Write an enzyme that holds these catalytic residues in place. Structure first.
Site, mmCIF file in Angstrom:
data_model
loop_
_atom_site.group_PDB
_atom_site.id
_atom_site.type_symbol
_atom_site.label_atom_id
_atom_site.label_comp_id
_atom_site.label_asym_id
_atom_site.label_seq_id
_atom_site.Cartn_x
_atom_site.Cartn_y
_atom_site.Cartn_z
ATOM 1 N N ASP A 1 -2.247 -10.926 -1.907
ATOM 2 C CA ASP A 1 -2.891 -10.341 -0.731
ATOM 3 C C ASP A 1 -4.329 -10.003 -1.125
ATOM 4 O OD1 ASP A 1 -3.607 -7.835 1.001
ATOM 5 O OD2 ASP A 1 -1.763 -8.578 1.965
ATOM 6 N N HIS B 1 -6.038 -7.510 -0.473
ATOM 7 C CA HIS B 1 -6.195 -6.081 -0.770
ATOM 8 C C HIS B 1 -5.453 -5.712 -2.023
ATOM 9 C CE1 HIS B 1 -6.773 -6.414 3.632
ATOM 10 N NE2 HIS B 1 -7.811 -5.666 3.339
ATOM 11 N N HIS C 71 0.812 -1.199 0.000
ATOM 12 C CA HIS C 71 0.000 0.000 0.000
ATOM 13 C C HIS C 71 0.870 1.285 0.000
ATOM 14 C CE1 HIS C 71 -3.723 -2.141 0.565
ATOM 15 N NE2 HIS C 71 -3.350 -2.661 1.711
ATOM 16 N N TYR D 98 -3.618 -12.222 8.807
ATOM 17 C CA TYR D 98 -3.818 -11.854 10.214
ATOM 18 C C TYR D 98 -4.258 -12.977 11.123
ATOM 19 C CZ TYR D 98 -3.069 -7.669 7.738
ATOM 20 O OH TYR D 98 -2.470 -6.801 6.900
HETATM 21 N N1 LIG Z 1 -9.048 -4.802 13.453
HETATM 22 C C1 LIG Z 1 -8.418 -3.717 13.167
HETATM 23 O O1 LIG Z 1 -7.761 -3.034 14.065
HETATM 24 C C2 LIG Z 1 -8.466 -3.172 11.787
HETATM 25 C C3 LIG Z 1 -7.450 -2.345 11.319
HETATM 26 C C4 LIG Z 1 -7.499 -1.806 10.051
HETATM 27 C C5 LIG Z 1 -8.577 -2.092 9.198
HETATM 28 C C6 LIG Z 1 -9.594 -2.952 9.651
HETATM 29 C C7 LIG Z 1 -9.528 -3.472 10.946
HETATM 30 C C8 LIG Z 1 -10.753 -3.261 8.761
HETATM 31 C C9 LIG Z 1 -11.041 -2.132 7.795
HETATM 32 C C10 LIG Z 1 -9.795 -1.755 7.025
HETATM 33 N N2 LIG Z 1 -8.633 -1.564 7.895
HETATM 34 C C11 LIG Z 1 -7.428 -1.027 7.248
HETATM 35 C C12 LIG Z 1 -6.542 -2.083 6.630
HETATM 36 C C13 LIG Z 1 -6.807 -3.447 6.698
HETATM 37 C C14 LIG Z 1 -5.960 -4.363 6.096
HETATM 38 C C15 LIG Z 1 -4.797 -3.952 5.445
HETATM 39 C C16 LIG Z 1 -4.044 -5.034 4.693
HETATM 40 O O2 LIG Z 1 -4.042 -6.219 4.992
HETATM 41 N N3 LIG Z 1 -3.535 -4.675 3.524
HETATM 42 O O3 LIG Z 1 -2.922 -5.590 2.658
HETATM 43 C C17 LIG Z 1 -4.525 -2.592 5.400
HETATM 44 C C18 LIG Z 1 -5.375 -1.669 6.003
HETATM 45 K K LIG Z 2 -3.759 -8.141 -4.148
HETATM 46 ZN ZN LIG Z 3 -3.973 -7.184 2.905
#
Ligand SMILES: NC(=O)c1ccc2c(c1)CCCN2Cc1ccc(C(=O)NO)cc1
Ligand SMILES: [K+]
Ligand SMILES: [Zn+2]
Ligand SMILES: [K+]
Length: 354
Positions: free
Chosen positions: A171, A173, A133, A304
């Protein structure tokens, strides 16, 4: 005929001082490392050392200002760390974050060097924080510097500018940073599979849609495979690889393959909501090994569920080591729609899709 592995306990030091349960945990990398030991994979690999990326290496992809701002966090008190992280979308910072990001990138440079100098055939990098990202001029989504993108440029810097690098980003995302960094490049083919949901899913941008095919001389060299309509799993990912990823990659004929290997599309991930199995990831890895004379570097991104990522990344390493793929349904309707939209988008550029 050797597989490299890089892991360094120091990458655990980056942490969230305000929320110790934030999913981008230190023990993501230690759990994966431990599972490699348990499965007797670690003793089969050639250990590659971690190192710091240099600031000049960071400048392959990042602005001087961005590098400077992240470096300045090493000395900050908690409230200034809080303020600085808050200037980004979804970032936490501790005093160790800059060093850990440097170590993640340098580990990957050393792995790419090992591959390209013939010391190893392929490699796996158990690194954090993640990278995909991160943009030229900013941090985002748990990422400070774009480790995979930097690795592609570092590879070019020790071979030639036009070295063909394929980045497969599995990934869950979209790697917005990687797409942007290479948007006008025909030397780096970016292929991402990602949950999209018409922009409801992070990072919430239409940049991730199938019609973003690349710009200028990079037109055709950016392949987004966006999923809509809830859970996807092994059938959908296998189909995407079959119809899209592998035919395009063969036609591109990469000289190096980087995998932005997040394991957040895995069964059990609380953020991804998908169902890709460890066996599924093993098959995806094994398919990529047919490219680039086997020169594949697997770089950890997200993911995660500690058990899921540990089993899934270990299965990938098993495939890199030459183990035979494990034994593995009609696609969801929306997945067929997604695949056909990408095929229509990319048939002008890739004869293999016609
Ligand atoms: N559970 C959490 O603290 C949390 C943190 C960030 C987040 C979420 C939950 C769900 C909504 C979206 N986000 C931001 C986010 C989530 C995932 C990632 C990631 O894995 N990117 O590859 C990057 C940013
Ligand atoms: K991807
Ligand atoms: Zn991701
Ligand atoms: K590109």
């Amino acid at each position: 005929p050797i597989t490299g592995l890089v892991y360094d306990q120091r990458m655990m030091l980056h942490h969230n001082m305000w929320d110790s349960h934030h999913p981008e945990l230190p023990q993501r990398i230690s759990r994966i490392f431990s599972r490699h030991e348990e499965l007797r994979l670690l003793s089969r690999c050639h250990r590659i050392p971690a190192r710091l990326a240099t600031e000049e290496e960071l400048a392959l992809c990042h602005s001087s200002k961005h590098i400077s701002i992240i470096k300045s966090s090493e000395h900050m008190k908690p409230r200034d760390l809080n303020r600085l992280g808050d200037e980004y979308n979804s970032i936490f910072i501790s005093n160790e974050s800059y060093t850990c990001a440097l170590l993640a990138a340098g580990s990957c440079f050393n792995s790419a060097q090992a591959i390209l100098t013939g010391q190893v055939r392929n490699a796996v990098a158990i690194v954090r924080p993640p990278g995909h990202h991160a943009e030229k001029d900013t941090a985002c989504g748990f990422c400070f510097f774009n480790t995979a993108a930097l690795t592609a440029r570092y590879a070019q810097s020790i071979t030639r500018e036009s070295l063909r690098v394929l980045i497969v980003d599995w990934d869950v995302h979209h790697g917005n940073g990687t797409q942007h960094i290479f948007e006008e490049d025909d030397s780096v083919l970016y292929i991402s599979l990602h949950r999209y949901e018409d922009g409801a899913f992070f990072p919430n941008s239409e940049d991730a849609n199938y019609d973003k095919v690349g710009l200028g001389k990079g037109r055709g060299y950016n392949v987004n495979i966006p999923w809509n309509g809830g859970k996807m799993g092994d059938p959908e990912y296998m189909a995407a690889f079959h119809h899209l990823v592998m035919p395009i990659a063969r036609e591109f004929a990469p000289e190096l393959v980087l995998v932005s290997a997040g394991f957040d599309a895995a069964r059990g991930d609380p953020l991804g909501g998908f169902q890709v199995t460890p066996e599924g990831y093993a098959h995806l890895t094994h398919q990529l090994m047919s490219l680039a004379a086997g020169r594949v570097l697997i770089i950890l991104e997200g993911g995660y569920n500690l058990t899921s990522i540990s089993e899934s990344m270990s299965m990938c390493t098993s495939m890199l080591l030459g183990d035979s793929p494990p034994s593995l349904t009609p696609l969801k309707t929306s997945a067929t729609v997604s695949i056909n939209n990408v095929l229509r988008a990319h048939a002008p550029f890739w004869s293999s899709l016609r």
